[PDB]
Design a protein around this ligand. Structure first.
Ligand SMILES: CC(=O)N[C@@H]1[C@@H](O)[C@H](O)[C@@H](CO)O[C@@H]1O
Ligand SMILES: CC(=O)N[C@@H]1[C@@H](O)[C@H](O)[C@@H](CO)O[C@@H]1O
Ligand SMILES: CC(=O)N[C@@H]1[C@@H](O)[C@H](O)[C@@H](CO)O[C@@H]1O
Ligand SMILES: CC(=O)N[C@@H]1[C@@H](O)[C@H](O)[C@@H](CO)O[C@@H]1O
Ligand SMILES: *[C@@H]1O[C@H](CO)[C@@H](O)[C@H](O)[C@H]1NC(C)=O
Length: 423
């Protein structure tokens, strides 16, 4: 009910057209998806109204496209929000002149409340004048004329939540419309910790997924899925259940994905660099190609999925044996149900080797509500969660969804429920 993905079709702007697509994956939003300028993220921004149209190539998705070469001052922090039952899901990104004097090095960067941050921009144009690094509008750092190095950094020792935000960089004689932008995302808890008091141990996320401080659950990079981000998805896909496909004969090449906040932006698995147009050198494979393969026996290292193990061996480095994993599978779920108003007790049934446990099965209502099982049991090799709805009413009828997520991956199956009242 909350799998929103913003696609920043090239964060570096030039003469070609650039866009921003906000996508709802596997759920009909019940409140308008929003796309616009994030004035709080960066001040002194222009206020031209954005033209937001429906992207007819992805079910539920909205996009903003900027007229080729009419790509005037569109530099700035943007965002696309999704509202689900009172909760807002926000994802942010920025746009900047490709012609820039300094390039951002990285679009966004995530650190822990402890972490000693090191914000850096790469020098592109050599001008004989002072270089400055701002933050939204205020001063942060400054470098003297004849001493502006090949890499312009700001050192943030012991980064705190307040240190998060958009960091600008440019030569003193410039302006906002010509700065380089970088977003620092600071988790409110230290590494592996989560909870209202950072009192809990996160789910170990592999393949560069990050742990959400308010849930302990992982947000995986495009191309992987499963509770711990270890399931390599089908080649050019994205979305929590990997049911979205990068349009184009070139995969997800020129696509930049930004996911819900604790994660930020990055390339899909197998690609790197701003623009994400660069493939990976041998031995690497995750998002922005930061993962180093280490296949214990020299097994193939695929830039998208990682180590390609031989018969009998699973795992990130082909270090495990035993029963091989099986992605969950929703079995025996009708396309329609038709039920009368009153007590309702639906069941979702799933298979898979790591057999879904009770904490991994949920039923999502058309309006986003997420229900947990009330009773549970598993047969020979099928998990069965049973849900209880006090009094299902007529308006609640729509497309409900069974959701199962384990280390073998995640799956969702939709079924249409019709509710009428007995005469
Ligand atoms: C008003 C202004 O231009 N500054 C905003 C400020 O409102 C906000 O508290 C801060 C938080 O990101 O962002 C900017 O600094
Ligand atoms: C096949 C299996 O073991 N499932 C049983 C099912 O027979 C029954 O309807 C339910 C009772 O609440 O318990 C489990 O779901
Ligand atoms: C939510 C949806 O997919 N709409 C269909 C609706 O058109 C159809 O009339 C009903 C019963 O026939 O099933 C679903 O509700
Ligand atoms: C109220 C109702 O259920 N009718 C809808 C009808 O509007 C639509 O044309 C058809 C196609 O999906 O589905 C259902 O028949
Ligand atoms: C950031 O710069 C400091 C200062 O030299 C350095 O000690 C630190 O390792 C850098 N951070 C990293 C690891 O990129």
């Amino acid at each position: 009910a909350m799998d929103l993905i913003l696609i920043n079709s090239l964060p570096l702007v030039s003469d070609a057209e650039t866009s921003l697509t906000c996508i709802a994956s596997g759920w009909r939003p019940h409140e308008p998806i929003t796309i616009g300028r994030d004035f709080e993220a960066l001040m002194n921004q222009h206020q031209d109204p954005l033209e937001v149209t429906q992207d007819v190539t992805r079910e539920w998705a909205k996009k903003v496209v900027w007229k080729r070469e009419k790509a005037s001052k569109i530099n700035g922090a943007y965002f696309c929000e999704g509202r689900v039952r009172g909760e807002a899901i926000r994802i942010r990104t920025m746009k900047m002149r490709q012609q820039a004097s300094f390039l951002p090095a990285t679009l966004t960067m995530t650190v822990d409340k402890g972490d000693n941050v090191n914000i850096s921009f790469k020098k592109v144009l050599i001008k004989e004048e002072d270089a400055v690094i701002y933050k939204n509008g205020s001063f942060i750092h400054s470098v003297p004329r004849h001493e502006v190095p090949d890499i312009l950094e700001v050192h943030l020792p012991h980064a705190q939540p307040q240190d998060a935000g958009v960091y600008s960089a440019r030569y003193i004689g410039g302006n906002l419309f010509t700065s380089a932008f970088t977003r620092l995302i600071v988790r409110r808890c230290e590494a592996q910790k989560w909870g209202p008091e950072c009192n809990h141990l996160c789910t170990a996320c592999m393949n560069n997924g990050v742990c959400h401080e308010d849930t302990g659950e992982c947000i995986c990079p495009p191309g992987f899925m499963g509770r711990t981000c270890e399931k390599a998805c089908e080649l050019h896909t994205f979305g929590r259940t990997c049911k979205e496909r990068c349009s184009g004969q070139e995969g997800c090449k020129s696509y930049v994905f930004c996911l819900p906040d604790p994660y930020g932006c990055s390339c899909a698995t197998g690609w790197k660099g701003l623009q994400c147009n660069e493939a990976c050198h041998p031995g690497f494979y995750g998002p922005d190609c930061k993962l180093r393969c280490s296949c214990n026996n020299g097994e193939m290292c695929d830039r998208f999925q990682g180590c390609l193990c031989s018969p009998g061996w699973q795992g990130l480095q082909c270090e495990r044996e035993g029963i091989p994993r099986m992605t969950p599978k929703i079995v025996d779920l009708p396309d329609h149900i038709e039920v009368n108003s009153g007590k309702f007790n639906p069941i979702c049934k799933a298979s898979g080797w790591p057999l879904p446990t009770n904490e991994e099965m949920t039923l999502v209502k058309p309006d986003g509500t997420v229900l947990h099982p009330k009773d549970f049991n598993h047969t020979d090799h099928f998990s069965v969660a049973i849900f209880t709805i006090h009094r299902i009413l007529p308006p609640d009828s729509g497309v409900w969804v069974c959701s199962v997520n384990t280390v073998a991956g995640m799956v969702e199956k939709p079924f249409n429920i019709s509710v009428k009242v007995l005469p």
